[PDB]
Amino acid sequence: MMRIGELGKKADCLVQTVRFYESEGLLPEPFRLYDEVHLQRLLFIRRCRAKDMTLDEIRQLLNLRDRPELGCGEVNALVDAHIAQVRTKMKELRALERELMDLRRSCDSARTSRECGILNSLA
Amino acid sequence: MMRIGELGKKADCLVQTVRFYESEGLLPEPARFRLYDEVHLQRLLFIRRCRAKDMTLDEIRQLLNLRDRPELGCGEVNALVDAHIAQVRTKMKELRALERELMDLRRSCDARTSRECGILNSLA
Ligand SMILES: [Pb+2]
Ligand SMILES: [Pb+2]
């Protein structure tokens, strides 16, 4: 059994982070003592957040993990939807890059603010 | 001269958005019971174009300060856009790596239960 400080140390995260996850309903119930189940939960959360998952996605995955008898098809759908999201964002960012490159080309090294091609194209 | 509602109509933005920009120091003082004029409209349009090019409120604040000083060199405007381009390029690299990571995750499950789920099991 561990206090929150020792749990945080073992999970390589701050006490305030553990308390954030508690306030968001991501940790099972536990002065308050914690054990191996809580540590493994924190590690699971950590790996999900490192794969860009939101708290809502993690809450859904945890609910499925807690119910081993349920079908896991929705897990595949969650990851597929995330992949689709990232692909759309990449397209948007490339278009933004090209837009900004065009903006940059509108001005040179030796001008005043009054003559600035960037400021003038934004006006 | 215009009230805020008319200014918002002309700039194609909400009154609350105008007030947000005011609270953030992005708009000059009202022309005159607050009244606005053409200068405020052109400012809102400038802000709109900047935000559509992914600029943050801090970058916009910087650009506005340089716009308000026409006698200065505009070299720092070029540097601001160059730094933004560099930022976007790094983000694109990170996102592509994330995409490839998520594709690998998805490949780990391929009519199973949660107990046997390859995705859930790889995250445990
Ligand atoms: Pb699955
Ligand atoms: Pb310039």
Q: Can you offer a commentary on this structure?
A:
- Two copies of one chain form a homodimer.
- The first copy, chain A, has one domain.
- Chain A is built from six helices and no strands.
- Chain A is elongated and about 70 Å long.
- The relative contact order of chain A is 0.08.
- Chains A and B meet through α3, α4, α5 and α6 of A and α3, α4, α5 and α6 of B.
- One lead (II) ion sits at the interface of chains B and A.
- Chain A: Pfam families: MerR, MerR-DNA-bind.
- Chain A: Keywords: Coiled coil, DNA-binding, Transcription, Transcription regulation.
- Chain A: This is Transcriptional regulator, MerR-family.
Which overall shape of chain A is indicated by the principal axes computed on the Cα atoms?
A: elongated
Strand content of chain A: under 5%
Summarize the main sheet of chain A.
none
Measure the end-to-end span of chain A: 64 Å
Total domain modules of chain A: 1
Bound molecules: lead (II) ion
Question: What is the helical fraction of chain A, as a range of percent?
Answer: 55-70%
Q: Helix and strand string of chain A, N-terminal first? A: HHHHHH
Overall strand count of chain A? 0
> How would you classify the helix and strand content of chain A by structural class?
mainly alpha
What is the multimeric organization of the chains shown?
homodimer
- Put simply, the count of helices of chain A is 6
Whole-number radius of gyration of chain A? 23 Å
Largest interface in this structure: A-B, 47 and 48 residues
Coiled coil (chain B): 81-114
GO molecular function, one term (chain B): metal ion binding
Organism (chain B): Cupriavidus metallidurans (strain ATCC 43123 / DSM 2839 / NBRC 102507 / CH34) (Ralstonia metallidurans)
GO biological process, one term (chain B): positive regulation of DNA-templated transcription
